[PDB]
């Protein structure tokens, strides 16, 4: 019920609202209307083989790049741009990395035991007519959901057509991902630094970038809590409209406040 409601919201509505090809993408993905009989098999393929395969390939590329483009290091006594000060792989690094893996999997197992996650038995089977009040995605998609909630219902109606509010959030996600992917090139174009940098710089030493990162984290947290405004309103007694409009105003006020505060804090 919960996850199918999330699918109905995001995958169906956002996809089908896209102006030129929205319905076409929706029908291609779902094999027809929303409850098409191939959605879950397609997602199963994508989720067990296709996307995890790409993730594995990209993690291999990532680790190979880190390995052969020797890991950068913070400035220190003997640390320069042309050396790596640390510990060798065999005696110390390997053992501590293996131990850290053991401890991380121990934390994950302890949480799997002691903390209940996704009680699907409580969450009845998906039915279009049924829904709950929570209706949230996992915390990583919570910012997209919060963007959906907060964006102020602006719809455009060209000649005999509709441009629903879903396109706004779709374009917002596109911009978020484009900016995240292209930041290093944006930063180099802005500042002008193309020098081969092997020594990290403390976040305080770069006030503008730490300020921008703090601003972005503030916006992300604002969106994430906007997605949770329902439960926030329920438990912390704040009217739901008040939470929605707090998010709406903050997503332009809170990023600026956090930017200024982080810049001055770094300096």
């Amino acid at each position: 019920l919960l996850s199918g409601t999330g699918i109905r919201a995001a995958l169906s509505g956002i996809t089908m609202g896209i102006p030129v090809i929205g319905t076409w993408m929706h029908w291609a993905l779902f094999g027809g209307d929303f409850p098409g009989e191939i959605l879950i098999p397609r997602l199963y393929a994508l989720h067990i083989l296709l996307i995890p395969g790409i993730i594995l390939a990209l993690i291999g590329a990532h680790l190979a790049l880190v390995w052969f483009q020797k890991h950068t290091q913070f400035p220190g006594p003997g640390r320069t741009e042309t050396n790596v000060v640390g510990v060798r792989v065999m005696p110390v690094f390997a053992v501590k990395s293996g131990a850290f893996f053991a401890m991380i999997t121990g934390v994950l197992g302890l949480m799997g035991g002691l903390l209940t996650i996704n009680p699907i038995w409580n969450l009845g089977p998906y039915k279009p007519s049924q829904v709950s009040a929570g209706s949230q995605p996992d915390f990583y998609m919570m910012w997209t959901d919060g963007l959906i909630r907060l964006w102020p219902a602006w719809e455009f109606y060209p000649f005999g057509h509709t441009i629903p509010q879903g396109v706004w959030v779709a374009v917002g996600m596109g911009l978020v991902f484009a900016l995240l992917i292209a930041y290093p090139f944006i930063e180099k174009k802005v500042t002008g630094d193309d020098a081969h940098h092997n020594l990290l710089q403390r976040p305080r030493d770069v006030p503008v970038r730490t300020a921008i990162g703090s601003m972005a984290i503030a916006l992300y947290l604002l969106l994430t809590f906007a997605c949770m405004n329902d439960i926030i309103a329920l438990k912390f007694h704040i009217s739901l409209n008040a939470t929605t409009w707090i998010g709406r105003i903050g997503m332009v006020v809170l990023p600026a406040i956090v930017y200024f505060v982080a810049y001055r804090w770094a300096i």
Binding site: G13, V20, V131
Partner: protein, 163 residues
């Protein structure tokens, strides 16, 4: 909620009382109870229809004078009965939450409220289009029956709409 047999049962206006909301579905006489194999597939289709579920609301007679009506939807209501699609006009989640004495149909997915008193126009949240209103009436024997079809597409909006 009967598990499988006679899941959908005909309905009468007297069943609801002022300030009452009931989720109804488009049941045909041919779509009899779920006993047969031929049935229980038509009924499953009815249940799983994305645009099928509707919410029938009994507007309180005292507040019936606050009702505003849409163009071409003025006679849709049967007395004090208003049938609005449950599917939210924005991204299609059901708008199942109903607040009586406020007459606000709230959608849990993204916190959009529609004023049921007026045509179910969104007075908050992401939704920008009013919920489609089903024409309703009573046939012989008094059972509630749709007096037609939605005069607009009922699900969430898309490019080819409003024409």
């Amino acid at each position: 909620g009967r598990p499988g047999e006679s899941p959908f049962v005909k309905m009468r206006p007297e069943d609801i009382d002022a300030g009452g909301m009931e989720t109804v579905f488009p049941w045909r006489e041919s779509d009899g109870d779920g006993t047969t194999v031929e049935s229980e597939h038509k009924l499953t289709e009815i249940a799983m229809g994305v645009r099928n579920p509707v919410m029938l609301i009994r507007i309180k007679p005292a507040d019936m004078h606050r009702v505003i009506k849409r163009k071409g939807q003025e006679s849709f209501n049967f007395g004090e009965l208003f049938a609005y699609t449950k599917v939210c006009s924005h991204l299609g989640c059901p708008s199942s939450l109903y607040e009586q004495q406020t007459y606000r149909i709230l959608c849990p997915c993204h916190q959009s409220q529609f004023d049921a008193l007026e045509f179910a126009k969104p007075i908050f949240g992401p939704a920008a289009r009013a919920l489609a209103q089903l024409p309703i009436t009573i046939d012989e024997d008094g059972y509630l029956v749709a007096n037609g079809d939605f005069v607009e597409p009922v699900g969430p909006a898309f490019w080819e709409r409003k024409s």
